[PDB]
């Protein structure tokens, strides 16, 4: 859908696709690592990987740490570079003068 311009313009469509892409990339890493490791050269050494609750707990915990750091960043420091944005305005005004 991203190929079509209308889908890219729509803000809800972008959010849904971005969430699906984030899940798909996790699945890609899972496929590359776990599936390849499960079955190997010797058939006798074949077993299935079943994740427990503790690795999931670590995963949500890392999400929480990431968002905590983001929230402190946005509270204390500016989210948008104050300079390089007024310089961008200066560059845009000069472009208008040279048409």
């Amino acid at each position: 859908p991203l190929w079509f311009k209308k889908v890219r313009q729509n803000i809800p469509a972008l959010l849904i696709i971005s969430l699906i892409v984030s899940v798909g990339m996790w699945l890609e890493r899972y496929v590359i690592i776990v599936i390849s490791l499960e079955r190997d050269f010797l058939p006798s050494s074949w077993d299935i990987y079943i994740p427990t609750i503790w690795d999931w707990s670590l995963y949500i915990g890392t999400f929480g740490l990431f968002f905590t750091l983001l929230f402190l960043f946005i509270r204390v420091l500016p989210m948008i570079n104050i300079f390089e944005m007024r310089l961008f305005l200066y560059q845009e005004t000069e472009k208008a003068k040279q048409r």
Binding site: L37, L42, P43, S44, W46, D47
Partner: protein, 951 residues
């Protein structure tokens, strides 16, 4: 803070005379599995037993040992062994028992000992037999009444039918070109197992020079280790074997009965008969203990006709003291207990309440008896219901004598004073004979002195055998009329039940031992559990599973599809089936065994104990209640309804087939004689189009041309999948025992593993392949290259070095190991709180902590000791030679193997056995397309098929 704690050191007060500190010693002792002694050499690190090995001078234990002898060390150090005398479960004293016993016996002297009864197992000790005979002389009306669940009653019954006298049958497999086995496991643990395995394996081992190989034909209800090492195997029902034996005698022309049989069985009969009469005096017929007495009588008759007697089969005077029908003697005792005639019962071991068949109701009849005394070495179920329980000294810590199947009279020697005290069986007999406080050492020595003499006693202790004692060869006379005039019962009464001793737990005595319970059972790979074993077809019909079961049958073209179907047929393993045999319901989970006979179920004894130690306290389902005295090893009718309610069964392998890969190589003998390299020349033609694969490597490696190089060769033809090597590695390298939950998560720690591939056409009657897998010590090792902290690096000799202290636990090395032989300590598996287990650990090898990887180290402790000793000898001589002998270093697995499949030696020394074996044309390394260049290599299996059955 300081690097380490004070680490105080405590020395002796009086030095032992013959001991040099830090130097282990070896002592000769005897360990008995079925009451038949097997000579063992046991290492005493500092006065404590630590490692059991074989006695090269002992018949039936020439270096090789069975798993039960290996795992006796952990049994002697079980933290659940009895420590005190219990009156009625309350601690008491030995003196109080001696007073009570004396009063009870003098109260029974009014009669002739009519109330006094005994109950031992198969007793072969000359000292105990003489003491029991003297006690019977003192009390005329006393009875011995031997019994043990795994006995040889049918053998002696058949002997008394064929010869009219109890004889001891011995088989010389070295001179038998054809061996036929009627439901007989001679390659499974039992009397004479190590001797039979070594002789059979030597014939199977084939080199370019060799021109002859032995052939084995086996007919059996359940696939077994003997079945695995057979050129031809027929899965006949257990009841049908007696009819098959009668038919074989009839076609040979000896007295028998023609029996209707399946066409495959008839073809097998034609091949066996045709192979015989072509090898007269070069053939032997072996009948299993489970089979009925008529089968044994027919086997003696067939051997006499072929003239095999005196060449392959030898008859000797009976070695088991007084041979008797044990099941009938127990039935006589239970009836007397029900009547109330017995007033005193003394039992030396044997766990009678648990072991006795359910129909007998021994426990209910035991209550009637006023006094019952049990010597068990553990507080067993019988001891719990018995007054005056007395702890029994373990064989390692006790003075004793035992006789081998051939007859040896070997002497058991204590390596340590009893840890918890306890009394030997002879000491109990002495108290009954009126001599209390009699030392075991004096009782055994007094009997032996004046028979072999004081000088003989000294030689007997130094060696593991008594030269004077052996069974005399006798020539018995075969009674043709008695053997011919026998019923030969016909098979067929509905679903049948086969009762087989557990491969790892035996009769359930070893249920407490952790190593045996954790050991994967051969051919089923199950751990910590008991399951009903049935063929895939049997499960589909009885449990109504939705599978065709004919899809498995097919040609080589659809082999990959049929292997996938077998995986789909699996996952039904663990469904609980309620089985009703004779008024008894077992409710046991079912595990599918492909090679099993149709309409037959195998149930393993030794499970469901309730008074066993914390390990194996309640594991598996007890099969003893359903078992009946009239038919101990066979069953006639079983309902086998399916109750669903699937129960998790844990297996180590988790895959039953090789997926079209060159892991196991199998070739015919006739083609091998023309070209030894034919098996290797083939395969490469299918894969690359050329006879030789031109593997190319971008990595140099190391020369190793002028230095000792250590390599191992494993012979596929010799291996029988006994699993003795796995137990030997666990004892030698202090490998931890993980729980059933850890095995379920695939975290079992075993340096050596045996894999069953079950690969064949049909897949309902597959050919079992057993391959031992251990670190290959690859000259170019992938695991070493991926290690960040350099914990795994190579060695000057060529050994891969794994340093536990350096390992940080990344686990990258296991991922890059192609053979997946590396085991990681995910949790703290090692036991730190148990003093007895701490004594068991070998000092030479470190006890690993959590977070470190482990792998086979080619028994580095043995190699380092030999290298230090060779260097020390060279410097003292002044030669500076540093020469190590070929036989100087033997790995624990190499010593343990009864067959001799594993050989360890220098590769560079061309005169070493490993160098000669590695020059064979059928030697190869696993996964050659990876440029690992392993040092552990395999010899491709060579078979000897008869043109009748095969072509």
């Amino acid at each position: 803070c300081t690097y380490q704690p004070r680490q105080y050191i405590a020395p002796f007060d009086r030095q032992p005379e013959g001991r040099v500190p830090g130097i282990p010693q070896y002592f000769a002792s005897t360990l008995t599995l079925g009451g038949y002694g097997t000579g063992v050499l046991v290492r005493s690190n500092e006065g404590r037993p630590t490692k059991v090995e074989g006695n090269p001078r002992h018949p039936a234990s020439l270096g090789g040992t069975d798993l039960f002898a290996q795992a006796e060390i952990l049994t002697m150090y079980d933290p659940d062994r009895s420590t005190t005398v219990l009156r009625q479960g309350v601690p008491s004293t030995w003196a109080e028992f001696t007073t009570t016993l004396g009063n009870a016996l003098t109260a029974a002297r009014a009669t002739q000992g009519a109330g006094v009864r005994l109950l031992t197992t198969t007793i072969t000790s000359p000292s105990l037999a003489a003491q029991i005979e003297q006690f019977l002389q003192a009390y005329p009306q006393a009875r011995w009444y031997q019994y043990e669940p795994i006995n040889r009653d049918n053998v002696v019954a058949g002997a008394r039918l064929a010869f009219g006298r109890d004889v001891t049958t011995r088989y010389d497999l070295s001179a038998a070109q054809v061996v036929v086995s009627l439901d007989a496991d001679f390659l499974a643990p039992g009397p004479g197992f190590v001797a039979y395995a070594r002789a059979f394996a030597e014939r199977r081992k084939v080199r370019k020079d060799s021109t002859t190989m032995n052939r084995l034909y086996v007919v059996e209800a359940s696939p077994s280790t003997t079945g695995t090492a057979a050129d031809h195997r027929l899965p006949l029902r257990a009841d049908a074997i007696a009819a098959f034996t009668g038919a074989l005698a009839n076609e040979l022309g000896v007295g028998g009965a023609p029996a209707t049989l399946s066409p495959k069985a008839e073809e097998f009969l034609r091949a066996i008969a045709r192979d015989l009469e072509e090898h007269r005096g070069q053939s032997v017929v072996i009948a299993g203990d489970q089979q009925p007495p008529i089968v044994h009588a027919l086997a003696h008759l067939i051997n006499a006709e072929l003239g095999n007697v005196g060449q392959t089969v030898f008859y000797h005077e009976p070695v088991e003291a007084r041979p008797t029908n044990q099941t009938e003697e127990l039935v006589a005792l239970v009836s007397e207990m029900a009547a109330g005639r017995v007033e005193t019962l003394i039992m030396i071991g044997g766990n009678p309440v648990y072991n006795a068949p359910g129909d007998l109701r021994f426990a209910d009849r035991m209550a009637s008896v006023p006094l019952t005394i049990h010597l068990s070495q553990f507080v067993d179920e019988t001891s719990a219901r018995a007054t005056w329980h007395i702890p029994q000294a373990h064989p390692l810590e006790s003075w004793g004598d035992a006789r081998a199947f051939d007859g040896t009279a070997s002497i058991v020697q204590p390596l340590i004073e009893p840890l918890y005290g306890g009394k030997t069986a002879n000491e109990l007999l002495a108290a009954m004979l009126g001599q209390p406080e009699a030392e075991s050492y004096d009782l055994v020595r007094s009997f032996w002195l004046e028979q072999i003499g004081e000088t003989g006693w000294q030689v007997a202790l130094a060696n593991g055998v008594i030269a004077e004692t052996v069974a005399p060869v006798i020539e018995p006379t075969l009674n043709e009329g008695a053997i011919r005039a026998t019923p030969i019962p016909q098979p067929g009464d509905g679903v049948e039940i086969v009762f087989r001793p557990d491969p790892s737990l035996f009769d359930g005595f070893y249920a407490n031992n952790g190593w045996l319970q954790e050991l994967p059972r051969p051919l089923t790979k199950l751990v910590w559990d008991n399951a009903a074993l049935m063929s895939p077809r049997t499960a589909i019909k009885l449990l109504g599973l939705p599978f065709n079961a004919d899809r498995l049958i097919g040609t080589e073209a659809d082999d990959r599809e049929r292997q996938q179907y077998l995986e789909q047929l699996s996952k039904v393993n663990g469904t609980i089936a309620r089985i009703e045999y004779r008024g008894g319901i077992i409710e046991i989970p079912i595990w599918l065994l492909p090679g099993h006979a149709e309409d037959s179920i195998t149930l393993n004894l030794g499970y469901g104990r309730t008074h066993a130690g914390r390990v194996g306290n309640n594991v598996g389902i007890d099969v003893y209640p359903i078992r009946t005295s009239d038919s101990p090893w066979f069953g006639a009718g079983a309902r086998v309804t399916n109750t669903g309610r699937t129960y998790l069964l844990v297996s180590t392998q988790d895959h039953w087939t090789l997926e079209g890969r060159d892991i196991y190589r199998v070739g015919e003998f006739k083609k091998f004689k023309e070209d030894p390299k034919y098996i290797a020349k083939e395969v490469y033609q299918e894969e690359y189009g050329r006879e030789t694969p031109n593997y190319q490597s971008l990595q140099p490696g190391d020369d190793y041309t002028g230095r000792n190089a250590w390599g191992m060769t494993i012979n596929l033809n010799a291996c029988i999948g006994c699993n003795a090597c796995v137990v030997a590695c666990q004892a030698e390298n202090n490998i931890a025992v993980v729980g059933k939950d850890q095995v379920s998560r695939g975290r079992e720690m075993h340096w050596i593993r045996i894999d069953r591939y079950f690969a064949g056409e049909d897949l309902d009657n597959p050919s079992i392949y057993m391959m031992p897998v251990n670190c290959m010590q690859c000259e170019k090792a992938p695991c070493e290259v991926v290690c960040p902290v350099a914990a795994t690096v190579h060695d000057y000799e060529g050994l891969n070095n794994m340093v536990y202290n350096r390992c940080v636990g990344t686990k990258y090395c296991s991922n890059n190991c192609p053979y997946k032989v590396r085991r990681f300590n995910f949790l703290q598996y090692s036991d730190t709180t148990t003093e007895t287990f701490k004594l068991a650990f070998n000092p030479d090898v470190t006890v690993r902590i959590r977070g470190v990887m482990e792998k086979c180290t080619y028994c580095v402790q043995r190699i380092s000791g030999a290298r230090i000793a060779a260097k020390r000898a060279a410097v003292q001589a002044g030669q500076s030679s540093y020469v190590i002998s070929d036989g100087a270093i033997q790995t624990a697995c190499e010593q343990a193997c009864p067959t001799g499949a594993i050989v360890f030696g220098d590769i560079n020394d061309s005169n070493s056995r490993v160098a000669k074996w590695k020059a064979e044309g059928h030697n190869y390394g696993l996964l050659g397309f990876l440029n690992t260049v392993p040092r552990t290599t395999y010899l491709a299996r060579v078979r000897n098929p008869s043109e009748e059955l095969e072509k």
